Write a protein that binds this DNA or RNA. Sequence first.
DNA 1: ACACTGCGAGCTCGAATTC
DNA 2: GAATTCGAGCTCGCAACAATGAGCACAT
Lengths: 280, 575, 152
Amino acid sequence: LGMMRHLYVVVDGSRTMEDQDLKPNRLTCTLKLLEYFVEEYFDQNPISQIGIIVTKSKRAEKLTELSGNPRKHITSLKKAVDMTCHGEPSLYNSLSIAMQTLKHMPGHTSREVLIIFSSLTTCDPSNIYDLIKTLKAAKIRVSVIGLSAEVRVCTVLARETGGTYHVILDESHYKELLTHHVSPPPGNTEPGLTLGGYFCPQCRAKYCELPVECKICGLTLVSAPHLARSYHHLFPLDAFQEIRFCYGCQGVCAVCQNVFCVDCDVFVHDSLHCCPGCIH
Amino acid sequence: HTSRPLWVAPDGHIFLEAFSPVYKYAQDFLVAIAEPVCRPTHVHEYKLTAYSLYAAVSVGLQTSDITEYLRKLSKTGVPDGIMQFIKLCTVSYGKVKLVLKHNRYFVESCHPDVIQHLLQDPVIRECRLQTVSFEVKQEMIEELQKRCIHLEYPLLAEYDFRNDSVNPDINIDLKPTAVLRPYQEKSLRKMFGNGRARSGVIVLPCGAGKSLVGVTAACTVRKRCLVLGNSAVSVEQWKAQFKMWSTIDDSQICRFTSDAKDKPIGCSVAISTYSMLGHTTKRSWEAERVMEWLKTQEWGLMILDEVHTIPAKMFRRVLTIVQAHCKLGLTATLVREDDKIVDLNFLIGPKLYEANWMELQNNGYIAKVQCAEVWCPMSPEFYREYVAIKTKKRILLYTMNPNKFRACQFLIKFHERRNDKIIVFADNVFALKEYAIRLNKPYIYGPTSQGERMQILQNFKHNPKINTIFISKVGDTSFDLPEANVLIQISSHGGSRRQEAQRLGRVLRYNAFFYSLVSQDTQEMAYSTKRQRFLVDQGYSFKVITKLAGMEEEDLAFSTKEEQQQLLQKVLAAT
Amino acid sequence: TSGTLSPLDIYPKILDFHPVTMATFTMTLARVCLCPMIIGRGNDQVAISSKFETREDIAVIRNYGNLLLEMSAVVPDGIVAFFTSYQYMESTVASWYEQGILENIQRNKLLFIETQDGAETSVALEKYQEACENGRGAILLSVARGKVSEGI
DNA sequence: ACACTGCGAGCTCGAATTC
DNA sequence: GAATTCGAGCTCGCAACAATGAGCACAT
Ligand SMILES: [Zn+2]
Ligand SMILES: [Zn+2]
Ligand SMILES: [Zn+2]
């Protein structure tokens, strides 16, 4: 159904992140919903990635490198609550850092940047309008979530590169905007299945209980039940025609010709996702 | 037998079961027949009355549509003391009609045999001067409407607005920007039943569409409306709700509140107040030439906001000064002391629609309120003087209780740390000062101004620093109090169950929850159960918080007894 | 016909004629497309007006600088600040700079003074419309009886 | 041959209760 | 039945009001 994704998350670190109108720290309410966002992203998208960049004082510093590590992100967002966040941000320096790595990904994916942006001013030493011709050439998809106002760049950066621009009503709207950024838009990788506890077959390296890639030999290690939930969307079961003694619960299929009741009929298509007669 | 979820009592009382499969087709039947008395979550209880059946036959159901569908939803069999009552109060509806035509009031009957019966009563012969008609005086239209109910030939005020050809049909049109919720569509359907407007009373909560129904009814009759209100603040809201949802220019929406006077002679919608149309003293000259214009033009759809103040002595003379065809009344709290709400059934008409206050909470149109009657014990120094005196000085004693001062200061601190907008409603204005200066909080004392009343209220909404506010008897109407989240009500008026349904109107405009501070073992304990008597009949549940969640651990005022001895000497020095 | 005939009964009094309609109109909107406000007294309850005696004192020049600072942090992409004259624009901007107020406005937005000569003005206007289109945003502080107030 | 707009007095109500 | 407490709106007297800057399109 969906495709692979390499999402970057640009987090604003300006003077305006000390603002109110949110949970105690405007910065803190951003990092609170981002930890919720990393969990739901990696759950619905199994083999994708997340980078997190934080822009501060006319410069961009990479908080976490681009890797599919659903633990290293949340353990780094907990550290960044005590950030200083002084100075005016940048947007040329942050989208270029998100372009030196995201350009060299293979073309079968959906490379994306997501900017969470509270300041109004991007003091950056060059012209932004040549990036939007470069990012459109490299098939990146930059989408901005704005705070408290609408900036002209963030409209023309979104609608030319291909993303969306959205401004916050409140915190119930800010969770609604981040929830819409987990569904993937409609190749052959080589991952290593990590049987035996959690060890790597290619380099035989033992490490932690994780769906993460292997550092010693560079292989990605996924768990096959986590891949298994994405099945049954492709070739799902066709419904039955319905016109006592049952076959499911023992108290009509067009394939195996075994009747069902009503509780069983709703249960087969909702949770079981297979016909109990057809497995025989 | 397991179906048919009613129990028609032999006097008259209808116990509807709100867990039945046919409940939704039996709750959309009993609204059109009976009036609700109590509505808990399981078994509702309606009630048949005389006025509730006049609203039934005014809609297209006749006397054989009601008395047959009661048998098919009975569970008992109708007890033959209701077949004699339904037949009596439905065949005597459309016989005597009160219609006006070009500034003259006429009592009309199609059957001449009841006019020969009507013209022997000695009080209807005082209000004088096929198709039999006789002209009645305008200034004795209230004493006429009592008598037609007194002999069971009630008057109907069904404005037939589709074709009258006398009134200047104005261009009020409801724009497609305001879509109305499915309870507002049901109230207007019961009003404009047969394609003719009907004079009734619609009871909707203030957080619900109490004003959108009034605008939509004005765009429906499309005649010269006239909106009334209880205050000069309430008409600057009614002016704003007409520009928001009805596409009217500012050369037609006028006002009559002694400060603006936007050329009130010759308009289409006039938004005035009570006690301006019924001001019984020598009026000013600008108001005299408007009242000479307003006393001689037949309106259509007078909109009487805050209906529960109409049966007063001065506010019911408005309905004889102004001549209107149909009279809609919009309110939120229909209950009122002194037993004059049954008197309102002939000043305006039958009660049309009451919103189910729990159905609007389960669908999201109203905030889920967690009522909590936290009561505080009495201090042993204050109860020493409470039982020694009886003559009104003990009202200060159960108001300025030091142990009630701690529960106000604790509940303010407990919700300032959750970023909640706190409103402390507090009457008895001596204790408004002594509560709001010991916590350094703003207070709308009531004789403050018009100026700093408007900026203290605006520093409360668009500022995340000022968090509490101490109102005093001002917010007992439909004012612009800006969407509070808690409401720590302290020591209000005596048994006003109208008040604690207007204090509740601030909260629903758990999500939000309001308290009620009571000094226990005093006279306020008997009062605070008289005022929940209306709210438990709507579904609300009042918990009791005997001891708060860790009150003694923070830095609360009046810790020692030395600082408590000084407060009693401040209270007892008033006398 | 114009857009801002302010009282309609003045123009037939000055110009000796008698109209037959003398009408006014208002535009319809799908939102509130404008939010007019009258920011009166200062943040410490000091009057803000530009009289002739209330111009030298620094309790008003600070309250103009404290306003343009706190509006340049919440308004995106362009603020036009019309002053009453040119000798009041000089004597306020050069009295914001000696205090610590013009330092904090240049952190948010660039500021482009509209001068009297047309060569510098068209330079400062083309950079203003460039600064509103890229990230930073700008402040075109000008004069109300000026060239930019009627043409642009 | 002086004088605009806010703002407090009386005046008369209402709501609910004491007296 | 006749007060009170605290709110309301409507009139209406009362005291005193204010007003500082700078330049190009159009006829022989
Ligand atoms: Zn490996
Ligand atoms: Zn099968
Ligand atoms: Zn079965």
